[PDB]
């Protein structure tokens, strides 16, 4: 909203805005470090903390949750944000806390989960939680990871690496893969993730780079699509994003390409 960012244009969100679609009546769980709910540029509808040492989901001592929140609303100005705090100030959290956050999002009928986070290692418990959210009809979006490349090996973080999740990589303003953006066959789509200006705690603004801001754009895009097509299943929202992406190169690096929310929101299934 208040900090200008190229990313909103890049994914063609203004075309939805000009049609009157802004993500009205869409519940988006920001599963991250909290959201600074006292930021004048944010509104938070509810939330929960699962970080025993950081009990307030409506404060953010990391900054990532608040930056994600601002990007979600820049793309989908009318979206209802829920602050699901599973990470501490150092941007780390236990998988069990993450799972508790996912469980809360399912129980509270979230339309979209955004997981601005990933760990290097697998968990059947984490996989069961995202698979359950998808089975319950939630669109589950996650940052692909900031682990760069590892030759022919996947560097996609968990839970982005699970097939049920939409794994989002990062491009710059000229649609080139960001050097940090994780790669592999599990990568699904790309979005803007380089020098993204958004809300920071304490009524501040600033640029962040990562798959974290990239995932935020796709969570917002899912909210725009649901506002035009509130009857679409998560399966149909996901298909619309993947099948209408702008091809950018080899899928190992770029998945299906850059999301195009204008194209996605008029996809015929």
Numbering used by the authors: 1 to 75, 85 to 278
From the article:
The final omniligase variants appeared to have a very broad substrate range, coupling more than 250 peptides in a 400-member library of acyl acceptors, as indicated by a high-throughput FRET assay.
Inspection of the crystal contacts of Pre-1, Pre-2 and Pre-3 revealed that at position F189 (S2′ pocket) the enzymes in crystal form A as well as in crystal form B have close contact (3.7 Å) with Asn109 of a symmetry-related molecule. A Trp instead of a Phe at position 189 would be too close to this Asn (2.0 Å W189-CD1 to ND1 or OD1 of N109) which cannot adopt a different conformation because of steric hindrance. For instance, His217 is present in two distinct conformations, one pointing into the active site while in the other conformation the sidechain of His217 is facing the solvent. On the other hand, His217 introduced in Oml-1 can rotate away and become exposed to the solvent, enlarging the S1′ cavity and allowing slightly larger P1′ side chains to bind. In conclusion, the L217H + M222P mutations in Oml-1 increase the P1′ tolerance due to an enlarged S1′ cavity that arises when His217 rotates towards the solvent. In an Ala225 template (Pre-2) clearly more strain was visible on both Val68 and Asn225 than when examining the Asn225 template (Pre-3).
